[model samples]
Target chain A: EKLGKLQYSLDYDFQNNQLLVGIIQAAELPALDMGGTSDPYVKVFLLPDKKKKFETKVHRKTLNPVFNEQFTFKVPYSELGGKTLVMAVYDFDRFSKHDIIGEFKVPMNTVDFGHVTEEWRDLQSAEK
Target chain B: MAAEPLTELEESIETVVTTFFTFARQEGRKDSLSVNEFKELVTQQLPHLLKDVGSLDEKMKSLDVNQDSELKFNEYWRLIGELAKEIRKKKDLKIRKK
Candidate 1:
C-alpha cells in the first residue's frame, strides 16, 4: 500500500526522579481522504500510560498538514525503557465518526536521549 | 453549537474499549468477554498483532488468570500491553539492524 508520510521529532529530559518530560515536537502528514484533501490531526501518547493524551490542532482541507505542536509527559527515566510512542493520524468528520487514516509506533529505548531525533515514518493501516 | 473534536488517540482508545464492550454484551454477563467473544475480538481486531501468538484458545487460557473462561477489561488490557511490548522489542531489533 502507498502509505502516507508522517514526520515528527522526539526529545526527552531526565532530571531528578522528579519529572522525565518526553516531547513530540511536530508532525507533517499526507492526505488520507478520498477527495485528495483531509482535515488531519495527530494523537500521541506513551503506551501503558494512556492517562495523558496529547493532540495536535486539526488542519483544514489539505493534502499536506503541518502540526507544529508539542506535547509533554511526566514519567521516570527508569520506567521509560518499557514504553512505546504511539502516534495515529485521522481525518476529522463533522457529522460522523472520525476515520483513522494510519498509525505508527516506535520504542522509547531506541531513541537517543542526548539529542532530539526527527524521523519521517510511513503510516501503516489502522489495526482495526 | 459545535461539539468538541476528539483527538486521534482518544478515538483509537475508544475503539478498543468499545470493541470490548460490544463483544462482552453478547451472551452472558456484560462485564466480561466470553471465550467466544474473546476469539472474535482477536480475530477481528488483533489480526496482525496476534497472528503468530499460537492458538487463540491457548492464548485465552493463559490470559484467563481466574480460570473463569472469560476476559475482563484488565485482562484484555494486559493482553494489549504484552503485544505492544513485543512490538517494542521488534522495533529495537530493527533499529539495531541499521
Candidate 2:
C-alpha cells in the first residue's frame, strides 16, 4: 500500500532570502494504526544541511487531510541549489514515538526559485 | 535559441533544446529535468530508443551524476549526444543494408 500524493506550493522571497513552503493537503494516505485511521503531520527539511526544518500540525484520524498551512526558511538564493528539500508525512503517536508514512524529496538546484513552479509529488515509501 | 547555425542539423538540435525546456518548465528547476520531467520526456519521445532501460529510478541514478536525482543540461545533453553517436554507428553499419 502506498501513500498517494501530497499537495504543496513553493515561493521564494529574494529580498529577505526566504523560502516559503505551503503544505496544502494530502490524499489517499495509508492507515498506520489499527483504528483504520491515522493522526498525521508533515515534516519539512532542506537537506545536505538538516540544521533548518519545520513541520505541520497534526490532523486526527483521517486519510485525507487539509493542511492549508505555510512555513518559512531563511537562506540565501545562492544556497538553494546546493540544498535538497525533503517533505516527510508522518503519523504522530501521542503515547510513543511517531511513525513515518511516506515522503518526497526535491533538489533545489533543479528548482527555479525565481519562477518556482513545483507541483504535488507522489509520496514515496518512507525510509525508516 | 542560437544564431542560425546549420541547415537540417541546426533544426534538429533546436528541436531537442526546445523540447527540453517545454517539460523542464513544468516543475522544479527551469533549466534542468527533474525525475518526473525526465520520465515524461522518455515516455513521450524516447520510448523505443530507451525501451530496454529498466526502472526509471535506476536509469536516473546512472544519468544523474552528483546524484541529486535531477538531470542538468550538461547531463541531459550528454545523454542525447551519446545516443546520437549510437545513431551514427547504426548509419555507419547500414551502408550496405539500405
Candidate 3:
C-alpha cells in the first residue's frame, strides 16, 4: 500500500567521511485513524550497520507533514556501497507504541554525492 | 442507542467506503477485489479520475504488494488515497475543458 512520497536529499563529504541527510517533508499520506488524520514522524538509518540512526520530530494530525530537519553519518567513502539508506515513515500513537506506516530502502552506491539531489520516494508497504 | 444523522462530508465518505463493498462482492473474495472486479470498478466509477494512469493492470501490479491478483481494502485505500491527494492539488492546478 502507498502512504505517500517522502522528500529528502543526500550529500557527502568524502574528505571528512560524512554523509549528510536532509529531511524536507512528506505528502499525500492516508488518514490512519478514526478522526481521519494521523500523527507521524520519520526514522532514518544507513543499514548493514545500524549503529547510528536519526528521527524527525512528530507532526500531529496531518496527512502531509513538513519536517525540515537534517542529520549526518560518519562513514568512509569505500564503505558507502555496502550501506543502504532506509527511510521509514511512522504513525505515532501516544497511548501505544508507534507503528511503521511505510518505507523505502535505497542502496548508497546508486546515489551521487558531493552535490545532493532532491529525492521524492514512494512509501511502500511495510508489512509482510 | 440512538442513530445520528451523517454530515455532508460524513455521508460522502460513507458512499465511497460502501461502494468498495458493492464492487468487492462481485466475484472471487467477498472482502477483496479480483483483477476483473477492479477493472470494472475503475471503468464504470472512476473514468475521469483514473483516466491518465496508463494501464490499470500495470497500476494494479504496483499497488498489489502481495501480488495476489486481488486487492484487499488496504490496497484499495491506497489507490483512493492517491486519487484524493491528486484532487487536492488539481483543485488549484486544473485548467482543462471537457
Q: 1 or 3: which has the higher lDDT?
A: 3
lDDT winner among the candidates?
3
Tens digits of lDDT, candidate 1, B4-96:
558998787767676666788877877788877777776577656653222455556656888878687678677776567655453221111
lDDT of 1 at B18: 64
lDDT of each: 0.60, 0.70, 0.70
What does candidate 2 score on TM?
Answer: 0.53
Write model 2 residue lDDT over A15-73, tens digit each, in one string: 88878887678998765532345677887756657757777788877889886878777
The lowest-lDDT stretch of 10 consecutive residues in candidate 3 chain A is A92-101
Best by DockQ: 3
Each candidate's DockQ score against the native complex? 0.02, 0.01, 0.04
| Cα RMSD for candidates in order | 19.4, 19.0, 13.0
Question: What is candidate 3's DockQ?
Answer: 0.04
TM-score of each: 0.47, 0.53, 0.54
Superposed model 2: Cα runs more than 4 Å off: A96-98, B1-98
When candidate 1 is compared with the true two-chain complex, its DockQ is: 0.02
Interface RMSD of each: 15.7, 20.6, 13.5
* Better by DockQ, candidate 3 or 1: 3
DockQ, model 2, C-alpha based? 0.01
Local distance difference test, candidate 1: 0.60
Give TM-score values for chain A, per-prediction. 0.75, 0.88, 0.86
